[PDB]
Amino acid sequence: MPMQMFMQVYDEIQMFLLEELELKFDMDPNRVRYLRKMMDTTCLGGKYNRGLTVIDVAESLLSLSGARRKRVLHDACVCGWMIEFLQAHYLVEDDIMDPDVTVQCAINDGLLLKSWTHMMAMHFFADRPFLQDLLCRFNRVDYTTAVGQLYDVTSMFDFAEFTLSNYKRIVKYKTAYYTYLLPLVMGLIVSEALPTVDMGVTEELAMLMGEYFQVQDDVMDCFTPPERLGKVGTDIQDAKCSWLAVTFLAKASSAQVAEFKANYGSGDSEKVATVRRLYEEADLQGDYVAYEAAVAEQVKELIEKLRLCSPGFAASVETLWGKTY
Amino acid sequence: MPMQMFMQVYDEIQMFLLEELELKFDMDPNRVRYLRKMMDTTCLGGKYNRGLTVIDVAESLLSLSGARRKRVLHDACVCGWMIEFLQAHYLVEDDIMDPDVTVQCAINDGLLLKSWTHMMAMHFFADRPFLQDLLCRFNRVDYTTAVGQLYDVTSMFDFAEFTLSNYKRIVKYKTAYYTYLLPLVMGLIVSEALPTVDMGVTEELAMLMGEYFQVQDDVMDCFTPPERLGKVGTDIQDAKCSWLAVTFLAKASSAQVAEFKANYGSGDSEKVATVRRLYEEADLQGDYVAYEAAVAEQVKELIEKLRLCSPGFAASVETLWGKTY
Numbered sequence: 001m002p003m004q005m006f007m008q009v010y011d012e013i014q015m016f017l018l019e020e021l022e023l024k025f026d027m028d029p030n031r032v033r034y035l036r037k038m039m040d041t042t043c044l045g046g047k048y049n050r051g052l053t054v055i056d057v058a059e060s061l062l063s064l065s066g067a068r069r070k071r072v073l074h075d076a077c078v079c080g081w082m083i084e085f086l087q088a089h090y091l092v093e094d095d096i097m098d099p100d101v102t103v104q105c106a107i108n109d110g111l112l113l114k115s116w117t118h119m120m121a122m123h124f125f126a127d128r129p130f131l132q133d134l135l136c137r138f139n140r141v142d143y144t145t146a147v148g149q150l151y152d153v154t155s156m157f158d159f160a161e162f163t164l165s166n167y168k169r170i171v172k173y174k175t176a177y178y179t180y181l182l183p184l185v186m187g188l189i190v191s192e193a194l195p196t197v198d199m200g201v202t203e204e205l206a207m208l209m210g211e212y213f214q215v216q217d218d219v220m221d222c223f224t225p226p227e228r229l230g231k232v233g234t235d236i237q238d239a240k241c242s243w244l245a246v247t248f249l250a251k252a253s254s255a256q257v258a259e260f261k262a263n264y265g266s267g268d269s270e271k272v273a274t275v276r277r278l279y280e281e282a283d284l285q286g287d288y289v290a291y292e293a294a295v296a297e298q299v300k301e302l303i304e305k306l307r308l309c310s311p312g313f314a315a316s317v318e319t320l321w322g323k324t325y
Numbered sequence: 326m327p328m329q330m331f332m333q334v335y336d337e338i339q340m341f342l343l344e345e346l347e348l349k350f351d352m353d354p355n356r357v358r359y360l361r362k363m364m365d366t367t368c369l370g371g372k373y374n375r376g377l378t379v380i381d382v383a384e385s386l387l388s389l390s391g392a393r394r395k396r397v398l399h400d401a402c403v404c405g406w407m408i409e410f411l412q413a414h415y416l417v418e419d420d421i422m423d424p425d426v427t428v429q430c431a432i433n434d435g436l437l438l439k440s441w442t443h444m445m446a447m448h449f450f451a452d453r454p455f456l457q458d459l460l461c462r463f464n465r466v467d468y469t470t471a472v473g474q475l476y477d478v479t480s481m482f483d484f485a486e487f488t489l490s491n492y493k494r495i496v497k498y499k500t501a502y503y504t505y506l507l508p509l510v511m512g513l514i515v516s517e518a519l520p521t522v523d524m525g526v527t528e529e530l531a532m533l534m535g536e537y538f539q540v541q542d543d544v545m546d547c548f549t550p551p552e553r554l555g556k557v558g559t560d561i562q563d564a565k566c567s568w569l570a571v572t573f574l575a576k577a578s579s580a581q582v583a584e585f586k587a588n589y590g591s592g593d594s595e596k597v598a599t600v601r602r603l604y605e606e607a608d609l610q611g612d613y614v615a616y617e618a619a620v621a622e623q624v625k626e627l628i629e630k631l632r633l634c635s636p637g638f639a640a641s642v643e644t645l646w647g648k649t650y
């Protein structure tokens with residue numbers, strides 16, 4: 001029912017955007033079918049973890065607070081695809097980072113995917129009293145993500161910023177705000193119960209779950225094989241400010257740090273294996289278990305504090321944390 | 326006074342955006358000075374033709390309709406920089422079209438410049454009753470520009486689309502909407518006199534002035550030397566759907582079209598000179614004078630129709646047309 005409704009609204013959103021281009025933007029059918037194939041390629045295929053979270057938060061606030069039910073659920077599906085389209089926009093920009101027409105189309109695809117989030121919001125929420133507040137919070141979170149990408153890209157240019165506090169700043173702005181906090185806020189806006197929750201505890205939970213999610217991703221990028229991870233890990237070659245790097249530099253000797261700096265950020269297969277050897281000898285995978293356990297305790301405690309004022313809203317956060325844990 | 330006030334508001338807009346990153350986004354001073362230098366590089370240096378147009382439209386509607394004067398003029402300066410920041414966003418995306426950190430920073434700069442238009446609007450217009458209507462029209466024009474870039478990039482991929490009607494469609498969506506129509510609408514919104522004008526005649530004037538502006542740019546790209554144009558013309562090498570191409574294909578013989586197709590879209594210095602020779606022998610620079618004269622007559626006539634219901638608003642359009650002519 002949730003996934004089936006989320007994909008049914010996708011056909012409604014896609015049909016409007018493509019017909020709007022045909023009727024109001026004078027687009028030929030050849031480009032309409034081109035943009036339909038591009039939209040399905042970039043937006044469909046994922047697990048829809050961000051989009052379905054908006055649905056799970058909305059369905060809890062309407063039953064635990066009937067023409068209003070069908071509207072709130074449909075509004076959450078549109079907001080769910082706004083984030084999925086936004087995620088597709090970020091992924092397209094990442095492919096460009098790593099008269100050529102394929103690059104011109106990639107840049108154009110990234111602009112259309114972002115603008116489509118505004119077009120589907122200005123239409124399905126044209127008469128909603130929260131249209132102005134939704135666009136402002138959506139644009140501020142998108143601006144937050146762009147700032148987080150500046151922290152991540154320039155994390156090794158200005159190992160001084162290879163600290164645990166700066167790592168949290170990267171995860172917070174680059175990932176946690178739009179992946180965990182944005183779906184929760186959008187579920188509150190479509191349910192008209194936004195000021196009825198403690199945003200401080202809600203924001204604190206979103207940053208902890210994103211931190212828990214990024215630490216697990218950093219370890220799998222280095223140790224999980226490519227066929228079992230789904231991609232090729234490249235954090236060591238790209239000199240990323242990963243959780244393994246900032247934790248190794250804290251418990252390593254002067255020679256181990258010198259050997260780390262002489263091998264980190266290189267594409268050599270032996271230098272990357274040297275960095276993995278330093279991570280293995282430092283027992284970082286043992287500290288990874290203890291670090292994630294402490295974060296999980298902080299999540300289980302803040303949900304109860306959020307439950308004292310948001311009983312149903314905390315039930316969706318546990319489900320959100322359940323799929324992260 | 327106009328230019329001096331427009332640059333004074335720039336310092337106010339820049340100071341807010343940078344302090345917001347320092348106070349609300351936890352940005353270190355090294356990156357704040359980095360973003361200050363990037364903002365001045367991408368946004369400053371141009372002629373500010375789009376930004377100053379918003380000021381000229383606003384000052385006419387307040388004197389030809391005193392604490393309201395200072396607010397409307399300041400609101401027009403913020404809207405003027407929203408377009409200038411938007412133009413800088415488009416230019417940065419064009420540089421990308423033609424672990425590399427310089428490309429990651431270029432993509433990040435393009436995202437920040439676009440988001441800065443929303444941040445400066447959500448702040449200086451936070452209590453304005455037109456904040457929701459301004460963002461929707463701004464996002465729709467930005468979406469219009471992205472669609473126009475799809476028409477321009479794919480103008481030779483799908484010489485069938487090398488027609489005068491499709492050329493007008495490219496100029497309309499790619500350039501005319503955000504360069505000529507957007508500054509006029511923003512001048513009406515800050516003056517609270519938007520529904521007091523004929524938008525049909527206003528839109529028709531914006532597309533004609535943009536068409537008049539693009540035809541002149543296409544001829545200068547081919548004939549004006551690099552030192553006198555400010556850049557190197559490359560429409561022939563890039564196989565662009567220029568006004569010279571769509572006009573040549575209409576008045577050329579079968580061999581001249583065959584010679585055109587065998588030389589258009591190539592970087593060879595002799596093939597580009599062959600295309601220029603075909604343009605010279607077809608007397609296209611003679612038709613360019615007659616085509617621009619007919620467009621100028623249509624502009625001078627629609628301003629009078631717009632004057633019958635918008636006396637002062639048409640005075641700024643003549644000034645807008647005066648700098649285009």
Ligand SMILES: CS(=O)(=O)Cc1c(Cl)cccc1Cl
Nearest residue numbers: 049050053179180320323324
């Ligand atoms: C979108 S994500 O990166 O997969 C994080 C996530 C997960 Cl893992 C499970 C449910 C919701 C979310 Cl937001």
Ligand SMILES: CS(=O)(=O)Cc1c(Cl)cccc1Cl
Nearest residue numbers: 374375378504505645648649
């Ligand atoms: C921004 S532009 O491309 O220079 C077109 C223009 C001109 Cl030429 C003169 C005044 C206003 C405008 Cl919008």
